[PDB]
Design a protein around this ligand. Sequence first.
Ligand code: CLA
Ligand code: CLA
Ligand code: CLA
Ligand code: CLA
Ligand SMILES: CC(/C=C/C=C(C)/C=C/[C@@]12O[C@]1(C)C[C@@H](O)CC2(C)C)=C\C=C\C=C(C)\C=C\C=C(C)\C=C\[C@@]12O[C@]1(C)C[C@@H](O)CC2(C)C
Ligand SMILES: CC(/C=C/C=C(C)/C=C/[C@@]12O[C@]1(C)C[C@@H](O)CC2(C)C)=C\C=C\C=C(C)\C=C\C=C(C)\C=C\[C@@]12O[C@]1(C)C[C@@H](O)CC2(C)C
Ligand SMILES: CC1=C(C/C=C(\C)CCC[C@H](C)CCC[C@H](C)CCCC(C)C)C(=O)c2ccccc2C1=O
Ligand code: SF4
Lengths: 160, 168, 80, 739, 169, 41
Amino acid sequence: DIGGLNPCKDSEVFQKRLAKTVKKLENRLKKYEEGTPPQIAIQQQITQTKQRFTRYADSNLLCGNDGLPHLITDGRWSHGSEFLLPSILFLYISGWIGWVGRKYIRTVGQTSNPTEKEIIIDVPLAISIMTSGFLWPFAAWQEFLSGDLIASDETITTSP
Amino acid sequence: EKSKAVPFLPRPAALDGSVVGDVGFDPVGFTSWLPLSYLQEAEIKHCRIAMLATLGWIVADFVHLPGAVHEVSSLAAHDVAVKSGALAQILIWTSIAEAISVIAISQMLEGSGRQPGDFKFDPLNFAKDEKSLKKMQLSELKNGRLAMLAFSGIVTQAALTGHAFPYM
Amino acid sequence: SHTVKIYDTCIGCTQCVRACPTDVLEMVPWDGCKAGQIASAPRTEDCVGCKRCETACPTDFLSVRVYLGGETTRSLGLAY
Amino acid sequence: KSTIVDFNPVETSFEKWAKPGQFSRTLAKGPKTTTWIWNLHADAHDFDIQTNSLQEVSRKIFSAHFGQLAVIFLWLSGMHFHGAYFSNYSAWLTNPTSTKPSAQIVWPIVGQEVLNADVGGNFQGIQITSGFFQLWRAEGITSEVELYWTAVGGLVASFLMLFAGWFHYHKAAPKLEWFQNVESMLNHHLAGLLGLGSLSWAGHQIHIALPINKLLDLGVSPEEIPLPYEFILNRDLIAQLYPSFNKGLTPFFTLNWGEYSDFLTFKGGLNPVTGGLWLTDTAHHHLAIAVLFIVAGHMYKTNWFLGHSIKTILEAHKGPFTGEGHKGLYEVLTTSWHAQLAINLALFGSLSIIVAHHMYAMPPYPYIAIDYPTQLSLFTHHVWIGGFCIVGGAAHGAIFFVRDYNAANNYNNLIDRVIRHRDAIISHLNWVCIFLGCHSFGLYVHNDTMRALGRSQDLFSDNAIALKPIFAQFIQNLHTLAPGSTAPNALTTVSYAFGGDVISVGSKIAMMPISLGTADFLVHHIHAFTIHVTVLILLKGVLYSRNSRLIPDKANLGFRFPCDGPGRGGTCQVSAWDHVFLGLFWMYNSISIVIFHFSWKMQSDVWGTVSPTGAVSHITGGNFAQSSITINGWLRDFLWSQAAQVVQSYGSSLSAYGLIFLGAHFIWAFSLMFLFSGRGYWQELIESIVWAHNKLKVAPSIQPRALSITQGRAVGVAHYLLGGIGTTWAFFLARIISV
Amino acid sequence: KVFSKSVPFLLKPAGLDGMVGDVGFDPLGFATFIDIRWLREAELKNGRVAMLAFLGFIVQEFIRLPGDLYSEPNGVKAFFQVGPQPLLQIFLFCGFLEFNMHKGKLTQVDMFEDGKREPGNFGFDPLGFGKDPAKRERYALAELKNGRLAMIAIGGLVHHALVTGHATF
Amino acid sequence: MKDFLKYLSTAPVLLTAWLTFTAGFVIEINRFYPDALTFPF
Ligand code: CLA
Ligand code: CLA
Ligand code: CLA
Ligand code: CLA
Ligand SMILES: CC(/C=C/C=C(C)/C=C/[C@@]12O[C@]1(C)C[C@@H](O)CC2(C)C)=C\C=C\C=C(C)\C=C\C=C(C)\C=C\[C@@]12O[C@]1(C)C[C@@H](O)CC2(C)C
Ligand SMILES: CC(/C=C/C=C(C)/C=C/[C@@]12O[C@]1(C)C[C@@H](O)CC2(C)C)=C\C=C\C=C(C)\C=C\C=C(C)\C=C\[C@@]12O[C@]1(C)C[C@@H](O)CC2(C)C
Ligand SMILES: CC1=C(C/C=C(\C)CCC[C@H](C)CCC[C@H](C)CCCC(C)C)C(=O)c2ccccc2C1=O
Ligand code: SF4
């Protein structure tokens, strides 16, 4: 399909990889005894390996000639769960972190001892700001509009 | 000088007379480097816990709650109750009570006025004036110490010899 | 020998002179500051370039500046 | 109002916990730049600059020692708890020669359960190379319940040491005169600590370890072995194995000590069953050590008209060549903690290296000689600790010279006379270092270039120009002839390394004569050269810590400073700290070469398997003799060849070793950013980053500053050491566990 | 010292004075390091949501809607059978409600920044219950107590469905 | 418990607690839903 890849559900090398891993795990399982915790752990390993391979097969995942899932990150929504949705999730979380950090910096920057409140965090104010970051996309595009997001010329510059 | 309990030892210098159950017994001077209120609270907590524990051990070796899980001796009941989750509920509610206790003991140590072990729990009265309260505090302390020693003996004997209620 | 220059931002706090290990700087009368004194560099032939002088300077970007130049047995700190 | 302690000196309060940097006069005002954060940790234990009183520094040091001992006890308790709960110690007891010791199981997350290896005995976990199983077996511990109780005792002891530290800083802190009783301290540490510890351990060995281990070697399973207390209450369970307890203590008090030859032997060699030292020999050794140390503890005058005064001993040791001699040394060592730390750390690291040597040379634990990973790990770890401690001793000698050295109090004594001719010492040490390096390494390079040019007869090899270590071979011959000639009451040599028979346990070689040829000559001279260069750097740091021809007032700049400036052609790294930095680098080099020599020589010419007919086949096959004489040989037949197991560990239970190999490479390369660069570039880059932050109104109030020059060097050296030591760690462990 | 009325062995907590549910219950002092107005707003919203969700349980197991999707008497299993499409619409509608009811200021630092906002007072009163101020305080206390009881009961019902799987009945 | 809570509010203790909590919920997500290469939806 895309880039010459093929779905992993029809990739023979993918099933060969699964079979080889299961065979190695079973051979390891053979050298232990009865329902002893080592055998239980190896059986859990086998079950998890089978579940992971089955989930990857039924996941709209494209496999190359090596039988490994390749990620299609050109931007198409068909393979949108590989990069685009995790990209949105990370952008949300990281914007949350950056927004709460910036808000805390600007909030304790207007107190008597701004530097003290950076090594000794005001946990009440920190908790107040941190749970308010869920609106960071909206807060950012409400502070940029008001001109409160960017400094203009009070920023320092070197000699040249 | 010359504490009441040990007549040849000096008075512990932190227990003069103004505590219930104060016979001047502190030979190793635990009160010389620890707060008196803290030790009193610990002692009263131990007294109550061990009284409940002794009564429960003795009763549960006689009467069992309905169910197959409750058909074990008190010596072996810990491993069964922890597996069934019975002790998990007690742990949860005891932890809630002990967090409230953290707050209470902190407030008592930093002023307040709460007497050690005084949770004001008194649905009935059983103590109307100062004299009755002092007498009942002494009774509680003595019964609690006796029950702590009794539970110690009960557990040690039952573990040594896996006998029923007579742990001889 | 190195080159040492003094600039009128001098506040005459004498910290440069009392930090020179080779007696290069000295305090001379002046009328451009409250202290009425300014640092001078009349013995730059003994300047070693250690720049202790400008480590003790409190003015914003320095009032004593050391420009390293040609080397000499005195400026190289050679006891041999 | 005791005469030794002060009562309630410091109040137990949490107020100062909420004021970081309260100890320092400069840091107490609060942070203004990020340099304050780094200065906070760099001055935490520098008690000299926190107080102006030696008494307060001594009390802080005493409580810090208690905290350290509590940490050590907690670590030991954790080790015993892991042995009790997450180990296959019981299975290893019944099959020491076929079960690999494991005492750490790995949770099944993110696929990391592959790390749980097939260590044997129906167990999965990480193979343990610390030798705790062998130590516990030598202690007579035959059950995991005993390990649990030892862990509980360790926890109790750790709490006790924590309480002791708190008590002796806040409730009863000793006075300066108590700390300065060096005669009493030496008497107690020599008699009580050392001698009585040896005596107590001899008692434990005789009454617990001797019978239990004898029963274990006889084939008695641990379950039917009597509990250790039964060997004390019943004089018949121990009198069957050693038929001399039937006489009781009467032979001891009647001076008929010959009766106790049953369990106090002098045999030498190794136990043929376990491959370790005879535990009867060990018990006799500890008894003799106890008596010797107890006797040695009655030397210094403490409180009676009896014993020696160290001041009078030192002051009487003058000479024509040494002026006032040792006059003033007693005042130096009783008023400066740094001098004591220097001596103790140097001798402590040297002792650690000696311990490392004597460990593999004479394996003291049952079934530890045939556990090659344990032997390799123990040697390498102890040599690394020794090198670090020696560098620390040099560092604190330099610190004493900078800070606590008084010129007036040391007029014409040994310290003064050493400083007065420091030039001669350093110049001759420089010449010796150049001579040794030229010779050792250039002989290596000559071998390499002769081999590369196809001239095999021009090498410094055994089949070529030969450099036989005749002096060491003479000593080896003297030791193998000692039993019956110079040690007439010995039955076997102290170690089979000096010569004798091949000792094998379960077809695995425990010890064997270590032949010394031209390959050992070159590597030994490499060791000497590296040690000499490290000594050169550290001694130059110590001697030139106060002044020099460059900076005549270097002592006024302190022990730790980056430079004096770009003048004098450049005065980088003139400190004494910058010498402990370079010396750390050279110690890494020396110890790395030492452990490489040990690993290759052991794998190639000691370790291996013995055929039933007596044919010895080694791990590598004797390639050390002919291929360790060229640098290409070291690169190919050792590094490239034995790195095969590390690089091929992916997908196996040793994959963690490959991951740590790669990560240690990454950290070592990361160090070079700090080692090669300078502060100005990073400060000017932080300037633009701060511009961006200010543009987005997110510039922190604590101004971000690049790490100071000294801190940049410290970060570089720490990362370099971590990366190199971790790379060697992963390489050694994967290689010696795979094969 | 005053000592709390609810927890009689603890000192009276601060910051609860002028409230409509004050029994002095704050052993952990959450009102000291968190704004009391925000705490009351959160308590009221959690209570109202829990009441609606408890009523939703009881109605769902009884009545249900026509259709194959809406055929699970168990609320927990109904959360999965209904699919993501109906749930995401509820999520977006609740978001729209949140935005319009608080008029933009939705966060802990933004809400109550200007004051003039009684905690939990959305002005929602179409049926007119609450014109008389005498019964207003009683209604507020009843709403608070019912909300707390419904939080406890919503947890109880959800966890009953998880440990048994059938229904509440 | 006024300065102890201030000590717990210091940068190292707060960072250690936050990173321990963060690693905790990450590890537990990866335990309950392991081997997640793509978005679950
Ligand atoms: C230290 C207190 C304590 C502890 C840890 C236990 C623990 C146990 N008991 Mg037990 N018990 C206790 C006191 C205690 N008991 C007392 C005082 C009595 C006398 C009424 C009993 C009577 C009793 C019987 C008859 C049985 C047990 C059984 C058991 C086991 C499982 C079921 C269970 O939890 O009990 C259930 C407990 C009860 C039904 C009665 C408890 C009454 C409480 C203790 C008195 C009120 C105190 C109050 C609630 C404190 C509030 C706590 C606060 C934090 C909110 C378990 C090992 C069962 C078992 O398996 O036996 C082997 C069983 O059949 N116990
Ligand atoms: C026979 C008596 C005796 C013994 C056994 C020790 C033993 C020790 N001393 Mg010590 N000391 C003694 C007499 C003694 N001292 C006297 C008389 C003085 C006064 C001059 C000092 C002054 C002194 C200082 C200033 C320091 C020590 C330190 C140490 C420890 C060295 C660390 C070590 O090797 O780890 C081995 C560890 C163990 C074997 C663990 C078990 C040891 C336990 C704690 C027994 C300790 C014995 C103790 C003195 C008994 C007092 C009990 C108390 C109730 C009175 C070690 C525990 C150093 C240290 O680490 O500080 C804590 C240290 O800085 N000592
Ligand atoms: C008994 C051992 C001992 C003792 C008591 C001391 C005590 C002291 N040393 Mg010292 N030192 C030692 C051994 C010792 N050292 C050794 C072995 C070396 C050689 C490396 C040195 C080298 C040394 C130098 C070069 C300096 C000191 C300094 C000091 C003083 C201040 C220390 C301080 O505040 O650090 C606080 C503690 C830290 C900053 C910790 C830093 C963290 C380390 C560097 C990294 C450890 C990594 C660890 C192994 C884990 C890595 C694993 C990874 C995967 C994460 C203090 C008197 C300084 C001073 O001014 O003396 C007056 C100083 O300049 N020492
Ligand atoms: C492979 C890299 C390397 C090499 C070769 C050296 C070499 C040396 N270092 Mg070192 N050093 C290194 C890395 C290295 N270092 C690193 C990375 C650091 C950073 C921490 C240091 C830090 C350091 C310090 C701090 C000190 C040294 C010192 C020394 C010298 C010890 C005396 C000696 O053996 O001289 C003999 C020279 C050699 C062994 C080099 C090879 C010479 C060949 C084999 C023989 C001669 C060849 C011949 C002349 C060629 C002629 C032909 C040509 C003209 C074409 C020596 C020059 C010490 C010193 O100054 O000397 C006493 C010293 O104090 N080094
Ligand atoms: C009921 C309750 C609290 C009730 C309080 C009520 C109603 C009163 C509230 C009010 O008066 C106040 C306070 C103040 C007023 O202003 C408001 C009102 C509302 C008037 C808590 C329950 C709390 C209930 C709890 C904590 C239950 C926990 C259950 C657990 C942990 C079960 C675990 C297991 O089931 C598993 C998981 C697996 C099994 O195999 C094993 C086990 C162990 C059995
Ligand atoms: C534990 C609890 C309450 C505990 C209360 C206690 C101890 C109260 C004790 C007291 O009152 C007493 C006794 C006496 C008072 O005088 C004093 C106090 C001390 C005050 C509530 C839990 C409350 C728990 C609640 C509300 C949980 C709700 C869970 C929901 C809605 C889950 C939905 C999902 O699970 C599904 C359905 C499908 C999943 O796949 C997806 C999701 C979405 C996760
Ligand atoms: C990069 C660099 C800096 C800048 C380095 C800085 C500012 C250090 C920043 C450290 C951050 C802020 C904290 C550490 C973050 C790590 C992720 C934590 C360590 C990892 C743990 C596992 C230990 C210098 O200041 C410097 C000075 C002198 C010579 C070389 C250099 C140099 O190379
Ligand atoms: S900065 Fe680097 S180079 Fe410039 S002086 Fe200090 S040390 Fe020498």
